[PDB]
Amino acid sequence: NDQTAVFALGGLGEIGKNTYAVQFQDEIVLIDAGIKFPEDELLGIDYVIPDYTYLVKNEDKIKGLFITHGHEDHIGGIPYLLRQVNIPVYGGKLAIGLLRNKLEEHGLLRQTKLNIIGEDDIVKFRKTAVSFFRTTHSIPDSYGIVVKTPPGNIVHTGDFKFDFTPVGEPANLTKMAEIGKEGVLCLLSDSTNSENPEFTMSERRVGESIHDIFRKVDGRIIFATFASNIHRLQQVIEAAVQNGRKVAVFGRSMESAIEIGQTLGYINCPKNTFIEHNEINRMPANKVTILCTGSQGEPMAALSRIANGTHRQISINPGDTVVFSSSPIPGNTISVSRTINQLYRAGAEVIHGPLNDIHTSGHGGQEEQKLMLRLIKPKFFMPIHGEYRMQKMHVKLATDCGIPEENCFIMDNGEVLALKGDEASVAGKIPSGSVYIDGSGIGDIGNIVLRDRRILSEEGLVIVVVSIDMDDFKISAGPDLISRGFVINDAQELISNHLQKVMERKTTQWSEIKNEITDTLAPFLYEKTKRRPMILPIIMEV
Amino acid sequence: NDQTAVFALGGLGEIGKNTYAVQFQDEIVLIDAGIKFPEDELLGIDYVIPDYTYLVKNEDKIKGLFITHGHEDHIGGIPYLLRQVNIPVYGGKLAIGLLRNKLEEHGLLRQTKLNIIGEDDIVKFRKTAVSFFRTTHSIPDSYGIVVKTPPGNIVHTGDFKFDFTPVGEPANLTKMAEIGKEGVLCLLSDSTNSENPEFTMSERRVGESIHDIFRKVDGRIIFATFASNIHRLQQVIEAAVQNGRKVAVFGRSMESAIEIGQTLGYINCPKNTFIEHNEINRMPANKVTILCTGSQGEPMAALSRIANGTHRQISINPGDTVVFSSSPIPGNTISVSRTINQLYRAGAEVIHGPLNDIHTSGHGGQEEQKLMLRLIKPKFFMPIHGEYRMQKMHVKLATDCGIPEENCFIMDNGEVLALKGDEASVAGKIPSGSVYIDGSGIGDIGNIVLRDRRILSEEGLVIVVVSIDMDDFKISAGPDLISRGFVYMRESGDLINDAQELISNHLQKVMERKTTQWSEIKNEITDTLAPFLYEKTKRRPMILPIIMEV
Amino acid sequence: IPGNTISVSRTINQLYRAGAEVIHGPLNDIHTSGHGGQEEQKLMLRLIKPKFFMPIHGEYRMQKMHVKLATDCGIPEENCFIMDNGEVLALKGDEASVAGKIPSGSVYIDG
Ligand SMILES: [Ca+2]
Ligand SMILES: [Ca+2]
Ligand SMILES: [Zn+2]
Ligand SMILES: [Zn+2]
Ligand SMILES: [Zn+2]
Ligand SMILES: [Zn+2]
Secondary structure, eight states, rough: OOOOOEEESSBBBBSSSOOOEEEEETTEEOOOOOOBOOOSSSSTOOOEEEEHHHHTTTTEEEEEEEEEEEHHHHHTHHHHTTTTOEEEEEEEEOHHHHHHHHHHHHSSSTTEEEEOTTOOEEEEETEEEEEEEBOOOSSSEEEEEEEEETTTTEOOOOOBBBBOOOSSSOOOOHHHHHHHHTTTEEEEOTTTTTTOSSSSOOOHHHHHHHHHHHHHSOOOOEEEEEOHHHHHHHHHHHHHHHHTTTEHHHHSHHHHHHHHHHGGGGGOOOOOGGOOGGGGGGSSSSGEEEEEEEETTTTSSSHHHSSOOOSOOOOOOOOOOEEEOSSSOOOOHHHHHHHHHHHHHOOOEEOOSSOOOOOSSSSSSSSHHHHHHHTEEEEEEEEEEOOOHHHHHHHHHHHHHTOOOOBBBOOOTEEEEEEEETEEEEOOOOOOEEEOOOOOOSOOOOOOHHHHHHHHHHHHHHEEEEEEETTTEEEEEEEEEEESSSOOOHHHHHHHHHHHHHHHHOOOOOOOHHHHHHHHHHHHHHHHHSOOOOEEEEEOOO | OOOOEEEEEESSSSSOOOOEEETTTTTTEEEOOOBBBOOOOTTTEEEEEOHHHHTTTTTTTTTEESOOOOOOHHHHTHHHHHTTTOOOOOHOOOOOOOOHHHHHHHHHTTOOEEEETTTTTTTTTTTTTEEEEBOSSSSSSSSEEEETTTOOOOOOOOBBBSSSOSSSSSSOOHHHHHHHHHHEEEEEEOOTTTOOSSSSOOOOHHHHHHHHHHHHHOOOEEEETTTOOOOHHHHHHHHHHTTEEEEEEEEEEEEHHHHHGGGGGOOOGGGGGGGGGGGGOOOOOOOOEEEEEOHHHHHHHHHHHHSOOOOSOOOOOTEEEEEHHHHHHHHHHHHHHHHHHHHHHHOEEEEOOOSSSSOOOOSSOOHHHHHHHHOEOOOOOEEEOOOHHHHHHHHHHHHHHHGGGBBBBBTTTTTTEEEEEEEEEEEOOOOOOOOEETEEEEEEOOOHHHHHHHHHOOOOOEEEEEESSSSSSOOOEEEEEEEESSSSSSHOOOOOHHHHHHHHHHHHHSSSSSOOOHHHHHHHHHHHHHHHHHHHHHHOEEEEEEEEOO | OOOOOHHHHHHHHHHHHTTTOOOOSSSOOOOOOOOOOOHHHHHHHTTTTOOOOOSSOOHHHHHHHHHHHHHHHHOOGGOOOOOOOOOOOETTTTTTEOOOOOOOOOOOOOO
């Protein structure tokens, strides 16, 4: 009507896929278009992506895609979205930088309009304008966003914590306060860490903890962290340098992040601090610092190979100290444990866990979330970037801060928020969903495919194959059983004796034979094996 | 030897399968014979079990199987062991009780000798004797074990914590102290919680926390915990009763635990405290207490059905309070989160986490483990019941308590410890391993089979089948492609059609050579199909050719 | 030690003012009590089997709380005697009680 619409195509009720939109009449601003990693249950899948059908049926209106920060769950689905619409993209220097590299691997670099913005840029459209304010997060150069529309102003926090002693440029509190004063129709705030009451430890503190390790450790330092945390990488290098240590880098994403961190200016280091892979074994233990990936136990990554049997250039020598400057993402806890066990078994010493202060969340806890709420004055409030419980708890925070429960909307992907100064409500849905990605396939693999993968994976299969030349109705080869994932000579006989009685009979079509095979083999296997393999007959006419 | 041997057939380098043995000459005492639950990566599997080949090749010598406590990871593999050897079993009243029920489901109840022992029993053999001492753990009626042998005494802690204000019978500290004085050659101590420096909170404290919830909650209480924790179940019932609430039970294991807890005497409750499933919806919110399973998010369990769509008799009404009187076992964290999200979405209120004091470990932390070490005087020390790191840290605890690092043996399943007053060492291996169980099939499965399921589950498969020859070596049928899990047939019938042609044109050029043989054809099919699919699809299906000679 | 908190603060202020660096407090692990806490006290109680129990070496509240520890460990409240200086405990296998006083007090020493 005469209101503004706000909605998510992904990012609500989940961590990942974060793609949000604000739409006013014929103009529509997109915020983020990330990717999501498949939960274990989606057997073959590589990535998950939002259903863009609405954005497609409305491409003409899309005025731009803006990028809060450069994390995969914000930036990662952009190649896939750009295959289905061609729209202009705006972001900070680091996000655009990372997306550039990404669009090469996909080819779509040539034909997309990449825009780099900064604190002070405003991009105006007919009846809609977009401004920015700096925040703090687990990656450099992160912005929140203000979308001005007639009915009022919408604010997107991006992903944020508060850090009063940051490694990077301090979050713009002055500007956030202004934004609230100027008036704010609705706030989309990061809900991820809303269950934690504590105030997020400062990166300054982990830096201190890093330097402390570098002074105490007598041998090699193997330091595993997240490639995307440029500032943390900076602290590690400094520690290494300031302790007369050289740095070897392991992992395409690590090299890739350091390279882009170096250009662009987040990483500065002297001359011969960096070292080549062969050079390691030469120098003394206490001058080597290996900086790799695999802090989540992912078994293809650097650290896991180093521990788990062997990697090429690096082996664990007793006295080595490995540092997990991370925290296990849910479900990776077993992976990480395995790695740690191996490292210990291989004689290393491990520094992991919370009692050592070598990690912090990139997402603010309750006090930080409430600081946002009291810097902006949202008439209305929509929790984003979290599972249901994170959204719920976030809302308790907002009601506790005075905003009425009837002005708080905990939503799902696809629901739409009708926003106007004197009224707001969930006014209906939009086409939404999840779209799967295995190999070069993009939405190419349905559920009916995944049910097969599941069935296979629990039970196995047994293939019954026969050649029959059905003129004098005779079985001229077989039946042969070939099985996988199931464990059959007795069965090969059962299905033979019986298949012969079925040919003598002879009024035999094709589908009835497949059925006669299945319908008499299955129960015999179940009898013997209490299992239920996928049994599938193949007939050859010869 | 003139030494005693000590070893594990499972339970080291892992949590689960706990089966340990002490052997002196021709006599050999077993302690525990548990089962283990499959890590996600073992696709089809139901349970894992130790390789008993050594126990089999030596059945005559086995003098008995003794049972510390009655947890599945200690008692659960016994039906499977008893299929391959018939030996006498000894245990406390609760363990034997639970194993009895178990042996019915398996049939082997008729033909096995179940023995019930208590604190004060000694079972003697030619040159070997077995005694007991009470400990505290997350299940009632738990014992530690002392195996006396000529070369010296071996002590097995079972699973233990320390609780000075327990719900059950207090751990026998006096007797532990005596055992150490009397002399101890080697200690096998529970390593599971060795990474935690803190002192384990007492069950008394959770009971208090339970009663507190029962006073504050205005509506229904849905209380999810571990069926095997009879004493915790007792505290829940008391709270319910003492607050004029009735108790509805949900879960076969929950009913089963309460029943055996009731008989045997761990659970006592008045008249009409227990309620039938239909009776719930009748009475007022604040008089209903539902006591179920599914605190780990297991999707077939009671609580999960209640939240996740629907269960039969029970739905979530706003105002309901669900209590997770548990802590998420590693890897179940995602399951539990889902459940909690649903519960919240369904208008419930949830009490989960550590800041509310509604759970404790059944396994002692560092101070407790050190108390053991200073009650027993082990010449030598062998950490048991934990992953490698837990064993390692446990050893640091032992060295810190003065026992020399060269007397501490962190071992793997199968390694054997030669023990004698003046010398000890890992003196060689024994046949050991893991035996998977799917269906009614023990070791019906191999690691090759799991590789197949793994390959199958991610990639799919494509079967290429051909009939060949009149002895003329011509292709008389095919090649036909039939695929599953690889691509949506109902739509890729375009892709696999091109492939059906590729493999035909090429397979014809291969038949006009006779510089070829059976294995070379399968390879020629695979080696030329695979890359084409990868080209088109970037997936890598398991491609397997079947040839028929006609 | 209670009541010395102001003394210690003054010293620390001066030290800081004089350009020193001070390591004080509980977050650095540079001190422990010489006296066990509740779990330790309960370990005692379960190593000895006291028919009867008398809390010593503490202010009233410390005696009281100590007794809650003993009752929690199963020893009956009527077998626990929180006493004052001078009271006397009549102890015999089948009976015990505070059976009267003795001359007691504090003698000050000045000079
Ligand atoms: Ca794949
Ligand atoms: Ca199965
Ligand atoms: Zn982020
Ligand atoms: Zn994010
Ligand atoms: Zn146990
Ligand atoms: Zn156990």
